[PDB]
């Protein structure tokens, strides 16, 4: 008797939340991916990182969110061992790629505001960083895809990660900590420093200085969002080490549906930002 089954009324409320997230996110990211590519004027070395960020986020909105939703709903894996491996690889890397892409655009913005005279990264180097980001993301997600396994419990089928068996689970502890440091603490440090130095310069003609203040607002929102939205995500994946008894309870199902919702909701913010701050993106959105 799987205890992670929930009443139809509960499922509906969760479905509506996730529905809003998924639809809004892909619509915006796809339109952002299109605006840049459709218009040669919008297709510049500068918008290479922005299209890369839009791709990875639409991917996690459609892949990581929809697929994980059904699995949380009944804790049943209706995808099979092959798709279990696929989900612990590309969708999870898409999450890492989006967070590293956010660190690339931050670097671009930092150089373009703090040192304006210095020339932009070469188109070739820009293309080298897009790959480095995606490469490192796939590398980090590899262990989770490698140890992917679909145990068929009498209650349900479940895709789980069979980390090398250790008395202190040293391997899975190191992996989850390194993930938390490389995709949460290290980004919170470089995106946070860059946005602070940029916002300190920009903040310090009413309409023109009002714009250099609106940008600073967007930047505080992005730093705060990436911190508030992603912290619960990491706490959830480092808590089976701190307290494995919590996972055995029933309320943990609803907790997961919430922590993923908050973390995946980050995808929707990037298109809305590009529309509010840039006219060529809001006009493009109606144009499509």
């Amino acid at each position: 008797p799987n205890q992670f089954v929930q009443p139809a009324w509960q499922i509906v409320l969760w479905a509506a939340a996730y529905t809003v997230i998924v639809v809004t996110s892909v619509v915006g990211n796809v339109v952002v991916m299109w605006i840049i590519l459709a218009h040669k004027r919008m297709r510049t070395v500068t918008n290479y990182f922005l299209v890369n960020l839009a791709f990875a986020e639409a991917s996690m909105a459609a892949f990581n969110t929809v697929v994980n939703f059904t699995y949380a709903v009944h804790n049943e894996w209706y995808y099979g061992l092959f798709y279990c491996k696929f989900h612990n690889f590309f969708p999870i890397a898409a999450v890492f790629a989006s967070i590293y892409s956010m660190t690339a655009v931050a670097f671009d913005r930092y150089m373009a505001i703090i040192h304006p005279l210095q020339p932009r990264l070469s188109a070739t180097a820009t293309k080298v960083v897009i790959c480095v980001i995606w490469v490192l993301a796939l590398l980090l997600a590899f262990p989770q895809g490698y140890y992917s396994t679909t145990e068929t419990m009498p209650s349900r089928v479940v895709c789980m990660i069979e980390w090398p068996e250790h008395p202190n689970k040293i391997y899975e502890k190191v992996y989850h900590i390194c993930v938390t440091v490389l995709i949460y603490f290290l980004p919170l440090l470089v995106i946070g420093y860059a946005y602070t130095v940029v916002g300190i310069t920009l903040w310090a003609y009413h309409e023109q200085v009002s714009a250099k203040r609106k940008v600073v607002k967007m930047m505080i929102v992005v730093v705060c969002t990436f911190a508030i939205c992603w912290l619960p995500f990491h706490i959830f994946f480092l808590l089976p080490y701190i307290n494995p008894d919590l996972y055995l309870k029933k309320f943990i199902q609803q907790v997961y549906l919430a922590i993923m919702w908050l973390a995946m909701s980050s995808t929707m913010y990037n298109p809305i930002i590009y529309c509010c701050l840039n006219d060529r993106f809001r006009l493009g959105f109606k144009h499509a």
């Binding site: 419990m153 996972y247 997961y256």
Partner: peptide, 11 residues
């Protein structure tokens, strides 16, 4: 150690 009450979450 798969348990009938254990929840399995995916990143």
């Amino acid at each position: 150690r798969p348990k009938p009450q254990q929840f399995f979450g995916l990143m």
